[PDB]
Write a protein that binds this ligand. Structure first.
Ligand SMILES: CC(C)(COP(=O)(O)OP(=O)(O)OC[C@H]1O[C@@H](n2cnc3c(N)ncnc32)[C@H](O)[C@@H]1OP(=O)(O)O)[C@@H](O)C(=O)NCCC(=O)NCCS
Ligand SMILES: CC(C)(COP(=O)(O)OP(=O)(O)OC[C@H]1O[C@@H](n2cnc3c(N)ncnc32)[C@H](O)[C@@H]1OP(=O)(O)O)[C@@H](O)C(=O)NCCC(=O)NCCS
Ligand SMILES: *C(=O)CCCC[C@@H]1SC[C@@H]2NC(=O)N[C@@H]21
Ligand SMILES: *C(=O)CCCC[C@@H]1SC[C@@H]2NC(=O)N[C@@H]21
Ligand SMILES: *C(=O)CCCC[C@@H]1SC[C@@H]2NC(=O)N[C@@H]21
Ligand SMILES: *C(=O)CCCC[C@@H]1SC[C@@H]2NC(=O)N[C@@H]21
Lengths: 506, 170, 506, 170
C-alpha cells in the first residue's frame, strides 16, 4: 500500500526540514545518517518506527511525534552482528520519556540475550520535565541493564553532542567513552546552578568540554576531529574485540613474518644513565605492521596502554614511559592501567608488559590525595588475572614498584630481562648511605663503597642467580620470543575458589 | 558508601537505606575532579547486589539522585515512604521556571504557578499512584515493618549469566 | 497525618456503600473480608493501595477509583509466608487494565523469587473493552509468569464468582482449581455468542456451572457449599504441601501409633469373586487418623487419588475403585491419575498405590476417543518418577494393566501382594479358549482344562517364584510395613541423563 | 500444535508461526469437551520454549487467541505484521454493542459509531504505536526477513530456575 510508504517517509523526517537544516549548520550529522555510516551497506533493520509518547499533561498531548526521539535496530559490521541505538536531537531535544526508555530497554535486553556488542550514540538534552516522576522510572531501568551486561558484552559509547543531567550516568558505566573534540560536553549540573550557588561564571565548553574530560578527569578515552573520523575509528576498533566472554579473540591472516630479527633495538637504551628514550618506538617495533590503537592517549602520559596484533591475534600492551616524570608511578597512572588490565582479563585477551620504573612519586599532594589505595589497585588487577602474562624488564626496577608491575611473584608466567636491566632494592647512593650510616663522616670511603656496591649488586645477574628471572635475552630477538611464548601459553587453565566476587579497593 | 555496600554484599548481609537527598554537589571543583565516575560507583554497587535491600524515603528525593540511592527500579525489593516525602524531578521553583519559560516576566503569575505545582506534585502520592512506592506508612511504625520485611526476605534467590567478573568503573 | 488516614480509609471502601450492600445481598464476601479470613490475625501487608488507571478514551478519565479492582499483598498462614491476590467485583466489574496487570505481575514475580506459594481468588468480569489492545498486553505478562513458576512453587486458585473470556486461561495453568457450588462459572465464550452462532439457547449456569465442571469436563478439583467453607478448606490443604521444590514436606507430631495392627482387614475381600468392595475404607484405615483430603472426588470415579499423612509426613495415595465399572482403567481415569502423579513427583512426595484392575474398557467409543494415548500418559508418569513408590496388589492385575499400575518392571521399589492376588496374562476362560482351540466343541473337557489352569496359574505364587513380587504379606500387617518401608526409602538418590524436558504424549 | 511445538523445542529447532485467527470455537460441545485445558496446552508449549520464535500476522488476531499464538508478551523474539493485520480486543460490531449498551436501538447512530470505531482501531497501527509489533513489512519481502532474522537468532542463550520438570496440564 502506498499509504504505508507515505507513513514511512514522514516518520523518517523527525522534527521537520527546518531543524535538520539548523542541525547541519552546526556541522553535525543527523541520527539516521550516523546509523547508515556505521553499518555495512544494506544491513540495517529498524525496530519500532511508529512508537509515540503517551503523556497528556501540561498541553503535551497536542504534539505527538512518531519515533519519540531515538532510532534503534541492528545490523552487521564486517560480517559480525551488532546492536545499536542513536538519540535524535531534533525530536523534543532528544529527551528521555517513558516510551523512549522502553525502546532502549528492549534493545539492551535483546542484545544481552543474543550476546552481541552494543554501540550507543548520545546527543541528548536531559530529562523531559513535562513527564514528571515517570521520567525517572525510565532512567532507572536503563541503568540496571547496563550493569547486567558489564563484563559479558563490550559496550561502546560515543558522545557527539550535549549530554547534561542524570542521563550522563548511562555511558559512564560502559567500557569505553569517546568524545568529539569541538562539539560535545558532559556534566551533571550545568552552568546556571553553578552561577546561582557559587557565584562563579563559567561557559559550558570550559566546564565540561572535550579537553577537560580527556586531559584532567579520566572520563574520556579519546577525541576526534569530527563525526566521520569518530565513526570510522569505532569501526576500526570493533575488529579487535571479542564478541563476548565465551568465544576467543578474532583472527585474521597477517602479512608479517614471525622469525624476523631487529638490529635497531640493540641501540635503543642510551649510554648515559640520565637520558630518557621513547618507549613508543619499542612498542611499534614489536607489533606486526606497526599498527597500534592507543587508549587514553592524552591522560596520565607516564604510562602507555593499548591494543596491537601478534601473529594475527589481539594482544594488550602496557608499558612504562621514561619521557615524562622519569616513569614514576602515581595515582593517575595506577588507575588507568588497573582498569585497562581488568577489561583485558575479563574477555581473555593476553597481556604483555614493558617495565622501566624507579619507584613512586613523593610529595605531600600525592599522599593527601590517597596514593596508597590507587597504587594498590594495579597490584590487585595484575595478581588476580588468569590470562597469559608476559613481562620484559628493560632498564630499571627499584623497590616496591618492581612487585606491582607483573612480577614473577604475583603470578606472571614468563619474565625476560635485557642485559641493561638493574634490579635492586633501591639506588646505590641511598642503600650505601643506610648500610654504612656510622661512617658518613668521610666522603671518599663512601664513594668507594658506592662504586663497589654499584658494581656488585646493580645488575640482572643476582636476580637470575636467585632464579626470579627465566632468561636474559638479547634485545634484537625480543619480538620472536614473544611470538613464540604466547603460542605455547594459549592453553593456560587454572581454577580459583568460589567467591561471589572480589572486594577490589575503590 | 560504594565500598561498604560491596563488602556487605560479598558476605550476604542485608542492607537498609534511609534516603534524604536533594541532588548532587555543584561546582567546577567536582567536575574537574571526576564526579561522573565516582558517583557511578555507587549506582554500580547498588544495582548488582543480590541481598535483601529495604529503603525508607523520609523527606526528599529529587532528580537523578533518587535513582542511585536504591530505587525500586534498580533492584530494591521494598520501598516504604513516610507521609512527608517529596519525590519529584526537581524543586518547585526551577521546575516552574523551566516549564513556563515564556511568561517569567510576571511575579504574581509565577507565584501562582509555583503554589499550584507544589501542591499538586511535591508529595508521595503521585509516585505511589504509579506503583513505584509499595506503601505510605506512619512513621512510628517504621521499626516493626523493617523487622517483618527482613524476616521474610531470607530466601531471596536469583541468578545472573556466567561472567568471569564485573567491570566496575575504578 | 490525619489526611493520610482519611485517604486510606476511603480506599478501603472500593466502589461505595451501595455496591458493598449489593454484594452482601447475594451471599458473597468482599475481597478484603476474604483476605482477612484466610491469613492469620494481624499479618496482612498490602502493596500498592493507591494505583489508578491511565486511559483517556471513551470518557474513562472522569472516574478514577483507587486500587484499580484488585487487592494484593502477602502474609502468613500457620507461620509460613504466603503471597496472594484477590479480584474485587465492585470496581469496574473487576476487569483487567494495564495497572491491574502491573500489580499482579509484581506480586507473582516477588512470590517466585522468594519461593513461597501463591493463592489467587477470582471474582471478575473479564476484559475491559474501553482499553483496547493495551488490555491484551496485560493478559500476556500474567500468563508468562505462571508458566515460569510452574513446578517451582505450588499455585492454588479459587473461583468464587464469574470468570469469563481470556481470564479463564490464567487459572487453567495452575495446580488446583476449586469452585463454589452456586455462584461461579467458567467459559471461554458466553451465552449470547453461543446463541448467535449455533442457535442453541442455554443459560450460563447450565453452560459452565459448578456441576458441569466438576463432573464432566475435568477442569475443577472440588466444590464447596459457600465461601467460608472454601476458604477454611484451602487453609487446611495448604498445610500439606511443601513450600517449594527444594525443602522437604512439612512434618508435624502425630498422635497415632506406628506399630498397631488392624485385624478387620483380614475379612475385607469377599470370597465370592463377583462382588465388589469399598477401597476408600482401606485407604482411611491406613492413614494416621482417618484424615484424607480427596481430589476430584466426583469426576472419573473408578479411580481414587488424594493426600494423607503417615508418621507425620504427607504421602500421596492412588487406588483402584471396584465399586464403579469393575475398576477398569479408561481415558478419564488415566488422565486424572497422570496429572496427580506428575504433581506429587515434582515436589518430591512419596507415593503409595493400591492395585485392583481387570483391564481396559472395551467399546468402539473409547477407541474413537483415543484411549491409546490417554492410557500411555499414566505409564509415562509412573515410569519417569524418581521418588519412592510402594504398591500393593490387593485383588487383581490382568494383562497390560498390571504393567501400567506401577509394576516392579517400570520402576516400583517395593511390591507386596496379599494372599488373594491373582496375577495372570488374562482371565482363565479366555486363556483356555485361546490355548485349546482344537477342542472347543466339547463342554466337559473345556471345564476340566479351565479348572486345571485356574488352580495352577491364577494365584500370586507363580509371580513370586519368578521374583516379581518382593513379599507376600498377611493383610492385617499392611500399615506397619508401609510405615517401615517409607522410613528406609527417604534417601533414594538416582541420576538421569541430561534432557531439556521429556516429550510426554499430550 | 502443542505436541509439535514441544518436539521442536526439545531438540533446538527454530519455529516460524503464521497467524490468522478470529477467536475460539463456541458451543456446548467444546465446553463439555474441556476446551479450557486443551487451549492452555498451546500457551504452555509456546511460552516455555527457549528457541527462536518468529511470528507473522497476516489478517486477523482477535481476543485471547492473539495471545496464545506466540505473542511478543509470552516470549516471541520478533513479531512482524502485514499491512492488512487487524489487532483488536474483538470484532468491531460487538465492541460497539458493548460500549454503547444504552442506545442499542437506534440503527443509524450505531452504524456511525461502528464506522468510526472500525476506521480508527481495526488496523495494525495502534498495536505498533504501543511497541507490540517490531516492524510492519510489505508482503513481498517476507522470505528475505525470515532468512536474515534466523541467522542473528542462532545464539539465543537464557537461564531459568532449577526444576525437576514442569507440571503442564494434560
Ligand atoms: C538542550 C540544551 C542543553 C541546549 O539547547 P540548545 O542547543 O543550545 O538550543 P535551545 O536553547 O534554544 O533549546 C534547545 C531546543 O530543544 C528543546 N529542548 C531542549 N531540551 C528540552 C527539554 N528537556 N524538554 C523539552 N524541550 C527541550 C527546546 O525547546 C529548544 O527548542 P528550539 O529548537 O526552538 O530552540 C538546553
Ligand atoms: C458480571 C456480568 C455477568 C453481569 O453482572 P450483573 O450482576 O448481572 O450486573 P450488570 O450486568 O448490570 O453489570 C454491572 C456492572 O459491571 C460492569 N462490567 C462488568 N463487566 C465489565 C467489563 N468486562 N467491562 C466493563 N464493565 C464491566 C458493567 O459496566 C456494569 O456497570 P453498571 O453499573 O453501569 O451497570 C457481566 O457484567 C459480565 O461479566 N460480562 C458482560 C458480557 C459482555 O462482555 N458484554 C455484554 C453483552 S456481549
Ligand atoms: C637522588 O637524588 C634520589 C632522589 C630521588 C628518589 C627517586 S624519585 C623516584 C623514586 N621514588 C622514590 O621513592 N625514590 C626514587
Ligand atoms: C536552589 O536555589 C538550589 C539550586 C540547586 C538545589 C540543590 S543545590 C545542590 C544540588 N545540586 C543540584 O543539582 N541541585 C541541588
Ligand atoms: C465376560 O463376559 C468377560 C468380558 C469382559 C472381560 C474383562 S472386562 C474388564 C477387561 N476388559 C477387557 O478387555 N477384558 C476384561
Ligand atoms: C458475526 O456474525 C460473528 C460470528 C460470531 C463471532 C465469532 S465466531 C468465531 C469466534 N468465536 C468467538 O468467540 N467469536 C468469534
Amino acid at each position: 500500500l502506498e499509504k504505508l510508504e507515505e507513513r514511512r517517509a514522514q516518520a523518517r523526517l523527525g522534527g521537520g526540514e527546518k531543524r535538520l537544516e539548523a542541525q547541519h549548520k552546526r556541522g553535525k550529522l543527523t541520527a539516521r545518517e550516523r546509523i547508515e555510516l556505521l553499518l555495512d551497506h544494506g544491513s540495517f533493520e529498524e525496530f519500532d518506527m511508529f512508537v509515540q509518547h503517551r503523556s497528556t499533561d501540561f498541553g503535551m498531548e497536542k504534539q505527538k511525534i512518531p519515533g519519540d526521539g531515538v532510532v534503534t535496530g541492528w545490523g552487521t559490521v564486517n560480517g559480525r552482528t551488532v546492536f545499536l541505538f542513536s538519540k535524535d536531537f531534533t525530536v523534543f531535544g532528544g529527551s528521555l520519556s517513558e516510551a523512549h526508555a522502553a525502546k532502549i530497554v528492549k534493545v539492551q535486553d535483546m542484545a544481552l540475550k543474543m550476546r552481541a556488542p552494543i554501540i550507543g550514540i548520545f546527543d541528548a538534552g536531559g530529562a523531559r520535565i513535562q513527564e514528571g516522576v515517570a521520567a525517572l522510572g525510565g532512567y532507572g531501568e536503563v541503568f540496571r541493564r547496563n550493569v547486567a551486561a558489564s563484563g559479558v558484552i563490550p559496550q561502546i559509547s560515543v558522545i557527539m553532542g550535549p549530554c547534561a543531567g542524570g542521563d550522563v550516568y548511562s555511558p559512564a558505566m560502559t567500557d569505553f567513552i569517546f568524545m568529539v573534540r569541538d562539539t560535545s560536553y558532559m556534566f551533571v549540573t550545568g552552568p546556571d546552578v553553578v552561577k546561582t550557588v557559587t557565584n562563579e561564571v563559567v561557559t559550558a565548553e570550559e566546564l565540561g568540554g572535550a579537553k577537560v574530560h580527556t586531559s584532567k578527569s579520566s572520563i574520556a578515552d579519546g577525541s576526534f576531529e569530527n563525526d566521520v573520523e569518530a565513526i570510522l575509528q569505532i569501526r576500526r576498533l570493533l575488529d579487535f574485540l571479542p564478541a563476548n566472554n565465551i568465544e576467543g579473540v578474532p583472527e585474521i591472516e597477517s602479512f608479517d613474518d614471525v622469525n624476523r630479527l631487529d638490529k635497531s633495538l640493540d641501540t635503543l637504551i642510551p649510554d648515559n644513565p640520565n637520558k630518557p628514550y621513547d618507549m613508543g618506538e619499542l612498542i611499534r617495533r614489536v607489533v606486526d605492521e606497526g599498527d597500534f590503537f592507543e587508549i587514553q592517549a592524552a591522560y596520565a602520559r607516564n604510562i602507555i596502554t593499548g591494543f596491537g596484533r601478534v601473529e594475527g591475534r589481539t594482544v594488550g600492551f602496557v608499558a612504562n614511559q621514561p619521557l615524562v616524570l622519569a616513569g614514576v608511578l602515581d595515582s593517575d597512572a595506577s588507575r588507568k592501567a588497573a582498569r585497562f588490565v581488568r577489561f583485558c582479563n575479563a574477555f581473555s585477551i593476553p597481556i604483555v608488559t614493558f617495565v622501566d620504573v624507579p619507584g613512586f612519586l613523593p610529595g605531600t599532594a600525592q599522599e593527601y590525595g590517597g596514593l596508597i589505595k590507587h597504587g594498590a589497585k594495579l597490584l590487585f588487577a595484575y595478581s588476580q588475572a588468569t590470562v597469559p602474562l608476559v613481562t620484559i624488564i628493560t632498564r630499571k626496577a627499584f623497590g616496591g614498584a618492581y612487585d606491582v608491575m607483573a612480577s614473577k611473584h604475583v603470578g606472571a608466567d614468563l619474565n625476560y630481562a635485557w642485559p641493561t636491566a638493574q634490579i635492586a632494592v633501591m639506588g646505590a647512593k641511598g642503600a650505601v648511605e643506610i648500610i654504612f650510616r656510622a661512617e658518613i663522616g668521610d666522603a671518599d670511603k663512601i664513594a668507594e663503597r658506592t662504586k663497589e656496591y654499584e658494581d656488585r649488586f646493580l645488575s640482572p645477574f643476582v636476580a637470575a642467580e636467585r632464579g626470579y628471572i627465566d632468561e636474559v635475552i638479547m634485545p634484537h630477538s625480543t619480538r620472536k620470543r614473544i611470538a613464540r611464548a604466547l603460542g605455547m601459553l594459549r592453553t593456560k587453565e587454572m581454577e580459583q575458589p568460589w567467591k561471589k566476587h572480589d572486594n577490589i579497593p575503590l
